[PDB]
Amino acid sequence: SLPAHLQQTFSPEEIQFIVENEPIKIFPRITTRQKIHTRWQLITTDDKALNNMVAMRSTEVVLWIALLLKQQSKCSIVAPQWLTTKELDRKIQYEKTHPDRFSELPWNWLVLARILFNKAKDDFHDPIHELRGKIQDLREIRQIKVLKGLKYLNESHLQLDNLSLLEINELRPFITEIMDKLREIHTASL
Amino acid sequence: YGDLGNKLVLEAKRTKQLYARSNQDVNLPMYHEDIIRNILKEVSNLRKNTEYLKEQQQLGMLDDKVAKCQYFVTLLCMERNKRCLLAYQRLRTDILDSMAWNNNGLDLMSSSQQDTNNLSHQEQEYLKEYCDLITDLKSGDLVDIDLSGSLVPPSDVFIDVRVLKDAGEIQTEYGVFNLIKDSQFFVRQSDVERLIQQGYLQKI
Amino acid sequence: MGYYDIDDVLADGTEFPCKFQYDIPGLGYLENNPGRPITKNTKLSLPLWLARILAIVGGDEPVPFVELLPPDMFSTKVMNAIKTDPVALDLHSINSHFFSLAIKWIMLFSEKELANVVSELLLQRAQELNHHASSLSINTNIATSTFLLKLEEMEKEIYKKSHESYKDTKRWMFK
Amino acid sequence: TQIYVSPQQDFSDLMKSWKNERCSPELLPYPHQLMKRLLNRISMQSQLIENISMGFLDMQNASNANPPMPNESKLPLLCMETELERLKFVIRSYIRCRLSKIDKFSLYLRQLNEDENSLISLTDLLSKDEIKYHDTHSLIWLKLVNDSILKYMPEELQAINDTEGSVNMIDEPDWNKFVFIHVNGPPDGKWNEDPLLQENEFGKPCYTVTIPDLKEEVELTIGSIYVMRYEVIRDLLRDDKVALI
Amino acid sequence: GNVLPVKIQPPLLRPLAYRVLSRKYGLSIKSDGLSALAEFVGTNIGANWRQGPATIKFLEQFAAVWKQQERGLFIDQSGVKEVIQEMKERRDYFKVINASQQQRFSYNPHKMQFIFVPNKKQNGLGGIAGFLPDIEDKVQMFLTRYYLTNDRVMRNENFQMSITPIKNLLGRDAQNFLLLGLLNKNFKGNWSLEDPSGSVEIDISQTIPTQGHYYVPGCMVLVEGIYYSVGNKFHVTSMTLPPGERREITLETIGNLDLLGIHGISNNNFIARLDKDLKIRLHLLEKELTDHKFVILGANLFLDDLKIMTALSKILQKLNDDPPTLLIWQGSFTSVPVFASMSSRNISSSTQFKNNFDALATLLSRFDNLTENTTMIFIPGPNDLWGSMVSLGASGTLPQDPIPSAFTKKINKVCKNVVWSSNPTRIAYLSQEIVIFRDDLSGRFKRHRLEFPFQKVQETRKLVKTILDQGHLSPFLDSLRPISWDLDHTLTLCPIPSTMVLCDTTSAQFDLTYNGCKVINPGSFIHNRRARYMEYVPSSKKTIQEEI
Structure with missing residues (x-):
């Protein structure tokens, strides 16, 4: 939609929505296995997982369904592997040891983190504050690396191998406009 | 000579800033058609002068170079004046469609400027035609989708809502809401978006 | 080059020095006595929107009626000033539509020594623009404001868009 | 499309088309069949949920009976209705973006439509309601501009489709705009049967594009985000080789 | 009602009213509007709750009747009035x-x-x-x-020569002018013209008026003449309504x-x-x-x-x-x-x-x-x-x-x-x-x-x-x-x-x-x-x- 210039870039709300439209693992608290009951029979999600379910077992559901069940007492969200101190330590060591490469990291970076820290507060084995501080440190390091890399802006192309969604979005308008200006200057000069 | 025309265009720029800084559709400024009709009068004088000059050129006593250069200058004058006027009107129509598209095509005369008399009569009939188009657009194959609804993605199912203005009781599907002044509701998000857009509810 | 663009229309109204390469009787009626013709090599300050076409029309030795003199905005002094230190230059005073007129001038006259210097100027200023945009308050010294008042008309749009993007990201981040 | 693997595939195609259209500087063609399936799906789902709700309402209001168990009853219908709301929001955003784009480029698309030599037709790009919107909006705006301003100028320049003199009035899209792309590679699971991809050191299958203006060649590997202009990338985007972010 | 009215239950009619009046068009249906629709349904008991087109099209007619009144965002007891308007729409003026x-x-x-x-x-x-x-x-x-x-x-x-305000006549003389205003008598007893800016005196001794009018005090007159700063006399040469x-x-x-x-x-x-x-x-x-x-x-x-x-x-x-x-x-x-x-x-x-x-x-x-x-x-x-x-x-x-x-x-x-x-x-x-x-x-x-x-x-x-x-x-x-x-x-x-x-x-x-x-x-x-x-x-x- 138009809304002034909101037709060119995504709003942060749209980013959160598109991220939360993703699968995740869950440990259910209840059971609705069919009596060998109302069918879930959704249209944009495999209902076999939701229908054929039993408590204290691992299964995969979309993130918003998991959040809805977490609002009730029917859910226990399983934390991902990269939300722990021992993985973040080797990650930060990787960025510090490599002053030119963006570290490998899922593009849902910072967003799943925000959502899980907002809602799934009590299910983490590690203390929340330490994880938040480590995430902040990673954010600072990647910000420094982005500023270091932006110093050159060719008119032909550019490469950014491991930037997350929000980092790309918050930088899109400035980079786009500057590159367009340079390109049109060169085109008018020839 | 078209310098006065610039005086219009510059003013239009300020209007865009009013559109820009607010980032909201409200209080479109009152028009400036007096300067426009002054420009129209002077360009009519220009056209009459051009026709006279062409008459003398066809008569034979006028030099060809003088006639052609005067014709070029006058044509540039008309082109620039038309450019200025169209630049004004394009932005006016754009902002008109902008606030017409989001208020369900009713122009919200019950609540935004009140009389809308700062718009020209031609602009007002254009607004009515665009409201007609908006009404017709959702009457086709998209009848089951509210195109003029909210554009913020749905994020939660239940929200707290605080009453802003007093009313009676309003029926909903399977239930009814009585709008007592200064009351707080714990209801579904997608059942009060129409009221929130109208401004009757607050504290989303 | 957009017909319905306010900024382009405004930039089209600046005056450029020019001289009557050819003598036309009966002209100058819009500036001086109408009965007095304009002689040869007469200097005038004409707007762009007619100087561009009158210098290319020819009319008829198919010499055009008017010849456009090098404007004082594009001079050796300004070239040296921008080549010395562009980041601290107050380019707002020289002109308010400097970039658009530079584009138009380089389009009319291809000069490979202008595109590179202007590109380096704006590239160097872009880093400072981003540095200031990313500086969100949590109210400032004189340096930020005195840089902000040196900006071009078009650079303000980039600065505002960047500031809004960073502000929105920060607002969504901390809730 | 010709057949559906699953409705989730249709959902993914819809979201990908929405993302492609949102950031594209040019009006892309119209996926009729996808929304043809989607509208029927929405209608049938709405009918089902309303039917079950009405049945439970009649059961609860015919007599006291037994109230429905909160377990496995409220949560399912909640899920269906919230999913339907989300899908409607996505479709609404897509349609409104298309409406804005056709608002901007009305004169250009009308100009290209009347050209017989051009192989592209307005029918493929625009839905019928969009055609009616374009024509009626153009006529109304033309009437407004003719009554307000064009009534007074001389015959030499009364037409607002003039492409002569100093400045033209038709706004072509900026095909050279810089966009953010993600090289999705081949949609096939083999991802190695395209006739275009080549290889470099350490394997790394890649596509080789060229820029005529700069007389350069750029290597585009799988899994790397690039910022590259739009004019030469139309084919890769159309073939679903790359996805815009 | 009909010849065989059936007393409805408002809950089972609520969805039919709410969908049409809150998702396609209309808004904020009150309870009295619901009762008016209830009695209208009582007047349309024929195969109702199973008849699609007629009820919805009559609701569309209700919209086409009630949109033009005020703004139509509420329906009070007047619902019966719009029902009667539906019936009546199915020298004065x-x-x-x-x-x-x-x-x-x-x-x-x-x-x-x-x-x-x-x-x-x-x-x-x-x-x-x-x-x-x-x-x-x-x-x-x-x-x-x-x-x-x-x-x-x-x-x-004709007028696009320009008129001049009275107060702008002070500093100029021996020049012709055009002006209009109220014509009356001053406190002294002379003929004067009044303008929001000010007032001047009138000289009549050589005035040729446009025939066909009743030049009466209290009537707006267009005055053409020459100012004289020797005194304050505006020597009029012609006058016309x-x-x-x-x-x-x-x-x-x-x-x-x-x-x-x-x-x-x-x-x-x-x-x-x-x-x-x-x-x-x-x-x-x-x-x-x-x-x-x-x-x-x-x-x-x-x-x-x-x-x-x-x-x-x-x-x-x-x-x-x-x-x-x-x-x-x-x-x-x-x-x-x-x-x-x-x-x-x-x-x-x-x-x-x-x-x-x-x-x-x-x-x-x-x-x-x-x-x-x-x-x-x-x-x-x-x-x-x-x-x-x-x-x-x-x-x-x-x-x-x-x-x-x-x-x-x-x-x-x-x-x-x-x-x-x-x-x-x-x-x-x-x-x-x-x-x-x-x-x-x-x-x-x-x-x-x-x-x-x-x-x-x-x-x-x-x-x-x-x-x-x-x-x-x-x-x-x-x-x-x-x-x-x-x-x-x-x-x-x-x-x-x-x-x-x-x-x-x-x-x-x-x-x-x-x-x-x-x-x-x-x-x-x-x-x-x-x-x-x-x-x-x-x-x-x-x-x-x-x-x-």
């Missing part, structure tokens, strides 16, 4: 209005637009005294008149405002306009217009002398067989002014006035056709109850009050359509606007004519030209004709009605038309042992008939 209820519209010069004025009767209390105008109204009245005249002058085709404008070009500047709006009205919230139904009503008027004839009588019909009653009886005998649509009686109904009675021996003046109308109710008992089919219009004259009671038969306030109800308690019962209005009154036809105004004009413009130092058909020509060029019913100052401070807008010829009823006992009958307006000049009802009354055909044709 004409109005008569007086100066008391005319809509108020101010003017703003800096925005060049009329502004609606809230009515004191509708928002204020008005319990004790709501009709008394405020102090500044008389200050602003002449300002408004000058604003309208200046706007008319500026909109002229401002030209007039036609109705269509006047309306098109404001589109088509609902000033005399019968189909719609404006308010402080918004402005209204309409032109689609105008052609429909015009073509409706073009047919059966000869059947909708309306007839008026002469002025000053006295209800005390036998001869007038005899002639009126003859006229009613001729008019009973073919009852017209509107029958208008104009002029004073008593030959003597009414006032306080100093004698308790004879019949009181008030009682005599009351009896002067009772006999009319008896005379109307033998003309049941005219009473039944034709409406009655009564217009007060110069010396009726309210005016002559203070002015003693002389001229007085123009917005004259209607005939008191206590003195007309039998006309309203004998007849079914009787209307009393002010001295100026407005009737709104389907495509016509007509005003009726009873006073003396020829003598007033003859006695007070300005003197310039240097076949009866021309006098009415000059009168019509002056009254139309000036565009006001009372082109006189406050000394001669006192006017209520607020109601002066009712005396303005800004909408320039299509036809005007110029009732003048001092002018011969005439049927002139000019500047797109047609004027009729009814004479005295009885003259030189003859009775005369005139009827106007809405097709721009007139007939004059007399009965000895």
Whole structure:
């Protein structure tokens, strides 16, 4: 939609929505296995997982369904592997040891983190504050690396191998406009 | 000579800033058609002068170079004046469609400027035609989708809502809401978006 | 080059020095006595929107009626000033539509020594623009404001868009 | 499309088309069949949920009976209705973006439509309601501009489709705009049967594009985000080789 | 309900109403609207809850009926009213209005637009005294008149040379100028022109006026002459009234405002306009217009002398067989002014006035056709109850009050359509606007004519030209004709009605038309042992008939 210039870039709300439209693992608290009951029979999600379910077992559901069940007492969200101190330590060591490469990291970076820290507060084995501080440190390091890399802006192309969604979005308008200006200057000069 | 025309265009720029800084559709400024009709009068004088000059050129006593250069200058004058006027009107129509598209095509005369008399009569009939188009657009194959609804993605199912203005009781599907002044509701998000857009509810 | 663009229309109204390469009787009626013709090599300050076409029309030795003199905005002094230190230059005073007129001038006259210097100027200023945009308050010294008042008309749009993007990201981040 | 693997595939195609259209500087063609399936799906789902709700309402209001168990009853219908709301929001955003784009480029698309030599037709790009919107909006705006301003100028320049003199009035899209792309590679699971991809050191299958203006060649590997202009990338985007972010 | 109504349960009808009225169109359905739809369903019990198209299409008709009223965001007990409107949608359209209820519209010069004025009767209390105008109204009245005249002058085709304000004449001399303003006498006794900027003096010794006008104090005049700073004398060389404008070009500047709006009205919230139904009503008027004839009588019909009653009886005998649509009686109904009675021996003046109308109710008992089919219009004259009671038969306030109800308690019962209005009154036809105004004009413009130092058909020509060029019913100052401070807008010829009823006992009958307006000049009802009354055909044709 138009809304002034909101037709060119995504709003942060749209980013959160598109991220939360993703699968995740869950440990259910209840059971609705069919009596060998109302069918879930959704249209944009495999209902076999939701229908054929039993408590204290691992299964995969979309993130918003998991959040809805977490609002009730029917859910226990399983934390991902990269939300722990021992993985973040080797990650930060990787960025510090490599002053030119963006570290490998899922593009849902910072967003799943925000959502899980907002809602799934009590299910983490590690203390929340330490994880938040480590995430902040990673954010600072990647910000420094982005500023270091932006110093050159060719008119032909550019490469950014491991930037997350929000980092790309918050930088899109400035980079786009500057590159367009340079390109049109060169085109008018020839 | 078209310098006065610039005086219009510059003013239009300020209007865009009013559109820009607010980032909201409200209080479109009152028009400036007096300067426009002054420009129209002077360009009519220009056209009459051009026709006279062409008459003398066809008569034979006028030099060809003088006639052609005067014709070029006058044509540039008309082109620039038309450019200025169209630049004004394009932005006016754009902002008109902008606030017409989001208020369900009713122009919200019950609540935004009140009389809308700062718009020209031609602009007002254009607004009515665009409201007609908006009404017709959702009457086709998209009848089951509210195109003029909210554009913020749905994020939660239940929200707290605080009453802003007093009313009676309003029926909903399977239930009814009585709008007592200064009351707080714990209801579904997608059942009060129409009221929130109208401004009757607050504290989303 | 957009017909319905306010900024382009405004930039089209600046005056450029020019001289009557050819003598036309009966002209100058819009500036001086109408009965007095304009002689040869007469200097005038004409707007762009007619100087561009009158210098290319020819009319008829198919010499055009008017010849456009090098404007004082594009001079050796300004070239040296921008080549010395562009980041601290107050380019707002020289002109308010400097970039658009530079584009138009380089389009009319291809000069490979202008595109590179202007590109380096704006590239160097872009880093400072981003540095200031990313500086969100949590109210400032004189340096930020005195840089902000040196900006071009078009650079303000980039600065505002960047500031809004960073502000929105920060607002969504901390809730 | 010709057949559906699953409705989730249709959902993914819809979201990908929405993302492609949102950031594209040019009006892309119209996926009729996808929304043809989607509208029927929405209608049938709405009918089902309303039917079950009405049945439970009649059961609860015919007599006291037994109230429905909160377990496995409220949560399912909640899920269906919230999913339907989300899908409607996505479709609404897509349609409104298309409406804005056709608002901007009305004169250009009308100009290209009347050209017989051009192989592209307005029918493929625009839905019928969009055609009616374009024509009626153009006529109304033309009437407004003719009554307000064009009534007074001389015959030499009364037409607002003039492409002569100093400045033209038709706004072509900026095909050279810089966009953010993600090289999705081949949609096939083999991802190695395209006739275009080549290889470099350490394997790394890649596509080789060229820029005529700069007389350069750029290597585009799988899994790397690039910022590259739009004019030469139309084919890769159309073939679903790359996805815009 | 239907022939076999079934009592519904509101919960099971709630979804059907809510979906249609909250997702496609409409909003905020109240409980009373739900009950109205419930009874409407009771009137549509045929295969209901299983019939799709008819119920939804009737709801769409409900929307098409209730959208145009206000804004349609609530439905109160009136739901039954819109149901009855649905049933009823499954000569009229004409109005008569007086100066008391005319809509108020101010003017703003800096925005060049009329502004609606809230009515004191509708928002204020008005319990004790709501009709008394405020102090500044008389200050602003002449300002408004000058604003309208200046706007008319500026909109002229010829004038695009430019006029000059009075105050700008101080520093220049020996140069010609053009200016306009109010013409009057100063406190000293000389002739002066007034402008909002200031005032100057007038030199008349060598003035050649444009013939065909009644140059009278209180009238806007265009003045051309040479300033002289030796004294303060503006030596005028020519004088001419401002030209007039036609109705269509006047309306098109404001589109088509609902000033005399019968189909719609404006308010402080918004402005209204309409032109689609105008052609429909015009073509409706073009047919059966000869059947909708309306007839008026002469002025000053006295209800005390036998001869007038005899002639009126003859006229009613001729008019009973073919009852017209509107029958208008104009002029004073008593030959003597009414006032306080100093004698308790004879019949009181008030009682005599009351009896002067009772006999009319008896005379109307033998003309049941005219009473039944034709409406009655009564217009007060110069010396009726309210005016002559203070002015003693002389001229007085123009917005004259209607005939008191206590003195007309039998006309309203004998007849079914009787209307009393002010001295100026407005009737709104389907495509016509007509005003009726009873006073003396020829003598007033003859006695007070300005003197310039240097076949009866021309006098009415000059009168019509002056009254139309000036565009006001009372082109006189406050000394001669006192006017209520607020109601002066009712005396303005800004909408320039299509036809005007110029009732003048001092002018011969005439049927002139000019500047797109047609004027009729009814004479005295009885003259030189003859009775005369005139009827106007809405097709721009007139007939004059007399009965000895």
